[PDB]
């Protein structure tokens, strides 16, 4: 039977970028014709493999990571990038083999008055490793004095909301992102393209 790419792309709600979701896709037949034949994708970049060549390759496991960021942050979902998202929320490896897909979701994820459900980590001490997920809400210590879970001077909540409003410019509007990672591990393959 087929790979459940629809449960990820057509999901009614996406996760915050800091707590990004991962769908592990194994033991199914995948068709990458429909994905590239769509016209609703504003971003569709592949690294290390052509999007038409995927119907000829087999991989051990395919990972579909999904989350929401704002328009101007989509450029950070690529190998070799820096910034709040790439450093503190979702980091792609320098030798990333896969595709990055994104589309404007201002009709779904923004509310008049603000949709404060989507968050991103603003304060973090060092950078994420590739494919790391930090879901900590510990108060961030910005000085020598420890915070003991109490907010104040030099003691800040590490997550910040986007407050997506539909009247925002596209750079501040929400974008749903799906990242397809093709793990060419060394084990009996399970996901082929057809």
């Amino acid at each position, epitope marked *: 039977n087929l790979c459940p790419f629809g449960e990820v792309f057509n999901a009614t709600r996406f996760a915050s970028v800091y707590a990004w979701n991962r769908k592990r896709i194994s033991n199914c037949v995948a068709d990458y014709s429909v994905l590239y034949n769509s016209a609703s994708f504003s971003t569709f970049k592949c690294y290390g493999v052509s999007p038409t060549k995927l119907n000829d390759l087999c991989f051990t496991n395919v990972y579909a990571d999904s989350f929401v960021i704002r328009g*101007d942050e989509v450029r950070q979902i690529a190998p070799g990038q*820096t*910034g709040n998202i790439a*450093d*503190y929320n979702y980091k792609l490896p320098d030798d990333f083999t896969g595709c990055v897909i994104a589309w404007n979701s201002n009709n779904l994820d923004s509310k008049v008055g603000g949709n404060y459900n989507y968050l991103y980590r*603003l*304060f*973090r*001490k*060092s*950078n994420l490793k590739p494919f790391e997920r930090d879901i900590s809400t510990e108060i961030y*210590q*910005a*000085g*020598s004095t420890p915070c003991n879970g109490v907010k104040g*001077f*030099n003691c*800040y909540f590490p997550l*910040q*909301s*986007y*407050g997506f*409003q539909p*009247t*925002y*410019g596209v*750079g*501040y509007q929400p974008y749903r992102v799906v990242v397809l990672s093709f793990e060419l591990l060394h084990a009996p393959a399970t996901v082929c393209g057809k």
Partner: antibody, heavy 117, light 108 residues
Framework: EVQLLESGGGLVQPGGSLRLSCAASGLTVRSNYMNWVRQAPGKGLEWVSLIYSGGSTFYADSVKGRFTISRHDSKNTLYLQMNSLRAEDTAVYYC???????????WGQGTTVTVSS | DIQMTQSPGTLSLSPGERATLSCRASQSVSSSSLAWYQQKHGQAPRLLIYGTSSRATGIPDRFSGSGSGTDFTLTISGLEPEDFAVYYCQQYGSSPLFGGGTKVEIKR
């Protein structure tokens, strides 16, 4: 007691180099977004350079390729290496701790850089 | 690119009057990314307001912020002699960006 004490400004000729220091107390440079903001005589504020606690650095187009922001965790000090200086780089330079959504709450007193032949 | 514009360049008021300082963005931005700064002559800037309307620590009640989208306002209720300075707004995209400034001077 929070304080950003800047030093290193002085007379430099165009094309020369100069390094500014920003000694902090009451906050950990290694743990913060830190900025350099300059103000030419008579004109407005201009953001120049930014460094993340995680180490990423970002620069204004007017200083890219010439300036380098950096720090020394032990000395709790922020630095700004300025190369290939130009007359338009003449300004008072401030360091500031940056909280992004919460603004730049702590500022230094400034240090003056004069670029002339 | 985004461009911030403050108006007027110079505001001429008497002590006790209400000052209204405008800051306009070239594209509609989140209210959390807009901050205000005061700079008195010969001094370093200080933070007045963050997140469009949140008053910073120690700032007097007479200062308040408002706006959204492309229009943002700094309001000073009951001007004080110490309040005649320059005021900069700042929009935070991927990096900070300051407006040109607005001078609040004494009317005569």
């Amino acid at each position: 007691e929070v304080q950003l004490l800047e030093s290193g400004g002085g007379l430099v000729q165009p094309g020369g180099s100069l390094r500014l220091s920003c000694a902090a107390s009451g906050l950990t440079v290694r743990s913060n977004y830190m900025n350099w903001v300059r103000q030419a005589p008579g004109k407005g504020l201009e953001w120049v350079s930014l460094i993340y606690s995680g180490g990423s650095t970002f620069y204004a187009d007017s200083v890219k390729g010439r300036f380098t922001i950096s720090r020394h965790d032990s000395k709790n000090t922020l630095y700004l290496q300025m190369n290939s200086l130009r007359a338009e780089d003449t300004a008072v330079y401030y360091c500031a701790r940056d909280l992004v959504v919460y603004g730049m709450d702590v500022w230094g007193q400034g240090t003056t850089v004069t670029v002339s032949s | 690119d985004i461009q911030m514009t403050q108006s007027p360049g110079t505001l001429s008021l008497s002590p006790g009057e209400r000052a209204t300082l405008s800051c306009r963005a070239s594209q509609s931005v989140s209210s959390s990314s807009l901050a205000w700064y005061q700079q008195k002559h010969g001094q370093a800037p200080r933070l007045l307001i963050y997140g469009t309307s949140s008053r910073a620590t120690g700032i007097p009640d007479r200062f308040s912020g408002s706006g959204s989208g492309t229009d943002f306002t700094l309001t000073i209720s009951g001007l004080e002699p110490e309040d005649f300075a320059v005021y900069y707004c700042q929009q935070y995209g991927s990096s900070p960006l300051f407006g040109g400034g607005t001078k609040v001077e004494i009317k005569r």
